[PDB]
């Protein structure tokens, strides 16, 4: 009688299941365990507005994912007006991919679940395959839901003969149960995949996500917008030309700008020990971050 | 008394096997555990008509692998004219591999069973080999049946030193029970599988499936045909130059063309949902550009 | 209950194979169920073609110690081997030879089916492994067969279950150790696709090794002529011609090629093969043989 | 399984560190064995010289949010920086700065010891790495120190063991993934000797970046002053004079040369201070030995 | 011997069953002549490692009963049972039996392969235990100590190969002037069990020839050499 | 010492099993003298220097130079005449296929280092074991190297455990950057010169018979670029002629066979060129 950590995690999984609010569906062992990673929508504090700079991609994702979910009774007659199985957001590191994912987990219904591949792989034999199958069994049992695989470039890597038989069979069972013999028809089971290097993801799984949204490094206008958002609620001195700094931070990403502004606010509060930012601390922060960014060279 | 979850699998498999329709065959513990995976033909909504673009392959599969199951009155005389003990489909990912088997499950009127390799593996000691045995036992028990294994290569990979003793033992038991000592009398049992990396399948299991079908990457004409297939029920209007749009999408596979058409239809319905309109080759040709930009991402 | 089915099956088969009543208490009885009936499988030496010298050598070296044993009783060294191994490329007669031997060799044949040896319960595996050799000498002469011996008896390593590694020493000690190899005539023959990782110890217990090469031109011609025997093949067909073009082809591959030709002929629904449908099939396989490449 | 003795050992350690009661199932317990008690450390801010701007910025950025936290709960933008790392040439302070932060910042600083994560059994390493963040948020405010993070989290390449890729991917995901990045206050810090091939995403994961450099002329005089405070240095020994001769040397090799020159006074006794001459001879010999390699 | 000591004595092989003697160990007489002064002399562990075959279990079978007093072989399978892990009891009862018949040598074939009962056996550890294994690589750390003497039964060399070969043809008819030294020179990597099969194939070459009663004129020896050479080249 | 510490202690060399002493170390006597004051002396008078903070023994000593000339010898000598139980690491006996093993085996080494103080460690062919850090290599190798470095510098200062790692390399040109820093007290055991030939022939000829009138300066002059091991290897060719002269029937070498040997070894030395 080994592998009895399922009851301890199962207590919390049932607690969270009751918290979210579901019908009397009863998971047995493995999907019951995977239910532990279910994320409550209220916990997420990020809405659609918090994602700034890029709105075309946001509108596309909305109209192509959430719209099929809502008023689904108007699209079943059409054979191919259902949400695609697999949406993957790609691009350079950062730039709000995980932010978009967190936003979707709240303002989309479609009870959200994070996979966290670590939980799948297990020590005992023939125990990780059970979890891999339970993932989709759950996705279709408490339907409708969305699955998230953070950093999907490593877990579902490009298949090779060198990988362990267990992990290879795991990523093959994923493919089989995704759109295989018995699932394709209609289950509104859509996986959402974050990726910083989509080239090494796969060739088959690359197609299993027909919808790929590019998340590029913020440009001039995008940078200005994302910085305007960050300083929306914070206090700054008057007549601060926000656009002017966009040129100074030519190649900065979203998080780089966030840190640039945060370090300036911290410099202000340190000078206190409650002072409006005079935009000179911002320039000093840009100059200081330019050196740290040029770490490799 | 451990591993008593066989009660739920027993109930499920018994109900499914009674639904599919069979005689009072006796299956006790493990054949029952595997019987839970039987796929009922009525559930499948795809047929030979839904599969298009490839006709020669479809005709060859309809004549060589299924007609022997139908024309049993003609092959009891000839020993060399029995059906092949295994046929596999290989090629690039997509374009009907997992769909041809879905159509077969319905059309061939067999006792199609989806193996789902995951069910074979078990944490307890020795259960994997016994389930591997029960698989073929049931197969011969309710012949004529077809066993399907999606991603055969990932499951039945090349034999190496770095594999668990149970997995290798079960993989060798498959080889021994499929065509080894006691088999191939008639048994009408054919094991087919689908894969996209056939080169790493095995040194000899490839021979265990002598007949193999290659699903070519969609070329121009079959691409146009499969696209016209999808564009028959929708509200697509006339004067759509199907040939040109099909020629534009060169490297596209079948699922990629399906996604392109779906995205074009959704773009078209955006206009209505904002406030029911034909796709007059413009939104289609423009969504082709979006799908092209989306494809050129691994570089 | 497992033991009830064991009772039925092993009592039916043991009595059907014509062995005088012996006491197979619990586990020897359980393994007796795997006994193969000499009548069921029907593959004679004539079915084996191409490799005539190898099959003759096997026939002699294995049967003559068993049959005509009276001539060999006075000798202490000329007795049936305590181990045989038939390796080589896949297919091409290995399990075919194994099947044929089980019929025209006497020496009641018992397949091992390694799967049955494993058991989740404690102690069942080792007890079954011992009961195998117990039964083998209980009803001698007997042949033991382990298909894909390389996988079952894989190279000993650290990454193996304690019971699967205990049965290794069990087998090794009971095969030719302290209480065997006197007057038992228990020959253990095995077949394997890959001889690389068989063993270092078990490899020694199977000294006699008959290697069945990939059928060459003449052996390919012979094996191909063999298959086209019952069906209505059209005369004037040059088997040597197709043999020339089937260089890389294997035995089972040629079997499937003939099957495809015959099924193509039947598609024209009662025609004899006139070497043109054979050409179609061989062209198809030459185009497709490089499935990996 | 060896986690029974590991739990027994980590018991005395965790409870010894003045903790709030928490239950650790199996893995967070295994990682708790790496806690470093503040009293065990014997390094403070005063033990560091030559770089006062860098350590002042370090405190201003990391300790100012931690300490006097009652002034930042009203603002969502002023939180401690996640992933503060200190790069630069080998030696000269990095690990010593980490120890100083560990001792003089409280917040139950913990070392990672990346070797403990690797395990032969399948699924062990991936599930163990999550226990790190689990314990960290369990007993926050905490610090996770990836010593020599250059090797642990390298630039992701196509060819790598299935274990390491999943390991670093789960690291990045648990860092700032779906359910994280709030007032938990967890702050990782790494001390790499080479920032060339650390990562592309992990680099962004670390916004704050400190530059520990080879001590300059003034910094070298400062560290030389600090070195011989406990020792009885001679009178009229110009530390600035020897700082010039020791141009390229870093801090550690300078401490070495100092110990070597000091041992000579003992050699002459086996007990007088160093009158600026033994220092010169020792630094000459050490320069020759350093340039002897090439 | 109430319950378990009887279960163990059930494996008590008899001296009359043994069929080996010192002459049967041909060529490897130096190791067994060094033995007596080492082991047989004290009475009137001991582990024998080496390559697969070539006298290990042969040397174990010889001196087992003809020398010593009523020794017993364990064959660890005897320990593991179906019920709730009673092995420990047996593991103890075994040594109990050992004190009954002072002395009785204990044999453990393939000791390398041979949970809690394992530690109990290690702990309980009069006679010197004899453990024969094909690989001393990873036998154990604690077990290796209890066995201080380790006789390396090496792969027979040229002279040793010829010595072991001449024994196989002692009571079997062969041709005169057969160069045993030459055939031994031919076989380089052969073991004793392999020379056995080679000479047996050579003799069968004559038996069959008669079947279709004759000495071996070294032609069948050469044929068996050429055949077993390819036979050995299986893994490679 | 549960599992790994025992695996490493299995390499513990016994002091009495080393037949080398300082009297058997010639040609460079300044090096062994510096060894006394820089390394042995801290270990000596330990009751004296506990008060001194920065005068404790060193951690990491490196002896580089072209092959031979005593790189290998002094090590065992340092273990014999100074106590301080010594262990050779056998760098090749570290790596294994099993995942996560090498890391634990290595950590066990530095554990053995401290729980058996005062313990020296010797890393032969450190270049081979700890080759220059490279961006492109087996992740396991770089991980092991970084773990070794961290545990070396990790929690050793202020502990006064007296662990003095020592590494020898034929070429220090591309050893490392940080690892080289880890071994500060580099000892330049260097190719000796004409003066050393006498020293090397002394220890070898003292036991056997060699007639007088054999000018040591002559054997030093006939060869100028020979190493420490090369001079011993050359004396072999000469001694063998004299030894053989009797077998074809116990004689001293009258400075002549040395000439033939030096000539033959000059010819052989001219092999690559
Ligand atoms: N458009 C935006 N508006 C506001 N903040 C942003 C935006 N884009 C990025 N950020 C900042 O970046 C951080 C999120 O980083 P992000 O989720 O993009 O990392 P990531 O690269 O997606 O992670 P991973 O590598 O695991 O995919 C947040 O703290 C947020 O403040
Ligand atoms: N000829 C076709 N007609 C209609 N749809 C098609 C065709 N070929 C592919 N598709 C589309 O592709 C999808 C099925 O993908 P497919 O079965 O080809 O993947 P696969 O490569 O078989 O997967 P696996 O790698 O598991 O074998 C379906 O949704 C279907 O709409
Ligand atoms: N010499 C032959 N004569 C007739 N048929 C042959 C011959 N060799 C192979 N075959 C064909 O090959 C099939 C048998 O394959 P075979 O028994 O050689 O597989 P195997 O390689 O022994 O199996 P495994 O790989 O498990 O050892 C039969 O259907 C038979 O028609
Ligand atoms: N500013 C300083 N003040 C006092 N000691 C110093 C200073 N800089 C360097 N040292 C000396 O250097 C040694 C510490 O080395 P350091 O921590 O710089 O190694 P490191 O190269 O940072 O390690 P890693 O390679 O893992 O980053 C101490 O013994 C200390 O005496
Ligand atoms: N010196 C010898 N004289 C005669 N026969 C020998 C000799 N050495 C080996 N043999 C032959 O080898 C066979 C015995 O093999 P052996 O007892 O060496 O196996 P083993 O290696 O002990 O088994 P395990 O590997 O299980 O320990 C006998 O049949 C015998 O004929
Ligand atoms: N400069 C020297 N330092 C130490 N030993 C020397 C020196 N010159 C000659 N020797 C003698 O040479 C012997 C060691 O030979 P060595 O040069 O180490 O050969 P190898 O390099 O092949 O090991 C020692 O016994 C030592 O007495
Ligand atoms: Mg992210
Ligand atoms: Mg598919
Ligand atoms: Mg076979
Ligand atoms: Mg440091
Ligand atoms: Mg033996």
Numbering used by the authors:
A (entry chain B): 43 to 315, 328 to 351
B (entry chain C): 43 to 317, 328 to 351
C (entry chain E): 46 to 314, 328 to 351
D (entry chain D): 46 to 315, 328 to 351
E (entry chain F): 69 to 112, 128 to 197, 210 to 220, 230 to 316, 328 to 351
F (entry chain A): 69 to 317, 328 to 351
Give the original sentences from the paper that presented this experimental model.
The mitochondrial AAA (ATPase Associated with diverse cellular Activities) protein ATAD1 (in humans; Msp1 in yeast) removes mislocalized membrane proteins, as well as stuck import substrates from the mitochondrial outer membrane, facilitating their re-insertion into their cognate organelles and maintaining mitochondria’s protein import capacity. ATAD1 is a member of a large family of proteins called the AAA (ATPase Associated with diverse cellular Activities) proteins. Six ATAD1 subunits rotate and translocate progressively to form a hexameric spiral assembly. Each ATAD1 subunit consists of two subdomains, a large subdomain followed by a small subdomain, and the nucleotide is bound at the interface between the two.
